[PDB]
Design a protein around this ligand. Structure first.
Ligand SMILES: NC(=O)c1ccc[n+]([C@@H]2O[C@H](COP(=O)([O-])OP(=O)(O)OC[C@H]3O[C@@H](n4cnc5c(N)ncnc54)[C@H](O)[C@@H]3O)[C@@H](O)[C@H]2O)c1
Length: 204
């Protein structure tokens, strides 16, 4: 139908803060999210490497994932919304690690055609959590791949920004084991980035 796309920083900010007041996260859930923002790539990366299974993990890490998953029972979005995200070349596969980018900073049109073939009109399963923003913010917009996610109403999604260890991200978190369908993939006006548009679905 129509996804709300925030255009103004101070509005997104207010809307998001308006959601956070309602969540009533347990003190325990809050300590688990704070810690996630300080260590996302470690956690998301173990999740990827053991394809979801958390039995090997230390007893702390298991306490932290269970609390993150639980959190989303309190955190859902009240309307259709667009979230944004930036990624580096490895996002597409090891093959694109050292080939997606030319020497001047442009997207190698060939790798783009390969990636488009490999991902366009297909589902992707992400084993880790997905961190996003309410807009294309300055910091993560410098990255070569920008993904705009369509998130439906009532879907699991949470504005954790207020208790993030870091600033300027307008951060919305989505749950792990989420799956999304990629609808479009083109280049930006200057050819320095790929814009992926994707439809978000559930978890497991
Ligand atoms: N990236 C964003 O759009 C965004 C938005 C808001 C907040 N954040 C915050 O920044 C930090 C999170 O960083 P992140 O999002 O880069 O961590 P991540 O765990 O999602 O990804 C880390 C690195 O691995 C890549 N990657 C992602 N999925 C992959 C996959 N399936 N296979 C191989 N590589 C993959 C990413 O492009 C990045 O280079 C946290 O502090 C979080 O709060 C990020």
């Amino acid at each position: 139908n129509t996804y709300q796309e925030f255009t103004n920083i101070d509005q997104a900010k207010a809307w998001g803060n308006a959601q956070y007041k309602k969540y009533g996260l347990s003190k325990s859930e809050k300590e688990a999210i704070v810690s996630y923002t300080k260590s996302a790539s470690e956690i998301n990366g173990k999740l990827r490497q053991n394809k979801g299974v958390i039995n090997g993990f230390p007893s702390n890490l298991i306490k932290q994932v269970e609390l993150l998953d639980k959190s989303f029972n309190k955190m859902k979005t009240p309307e259709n919304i667009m979230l944004f995200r930036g990624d580096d070349p490895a996002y597409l596969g090891t093959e694109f690690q050292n080939t997606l980018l030319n020497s001047n900073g442009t997207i190698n049109k060939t790798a783009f055609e390969k990636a488009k073939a490999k991902f366009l009109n297909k589902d992707r399963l992400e084993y880790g959590y997905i961190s996003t923003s309410l807009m294309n913010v300055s910091q993560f917009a410098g990255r070569p791949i920008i993904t705009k996610f369509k998130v439906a109403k009532g879907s699991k999604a949470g504005y954790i920004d207020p208790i993030s260890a870091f600033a300027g991200a307008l951060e919305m978190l989505l749950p792990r084991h989420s799956t999304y369908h990629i609808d479009d993939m083109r280049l930006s006006s200057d050819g320095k980035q790929i814009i992926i548009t994707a439809t978000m679905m559930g978890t497991a």
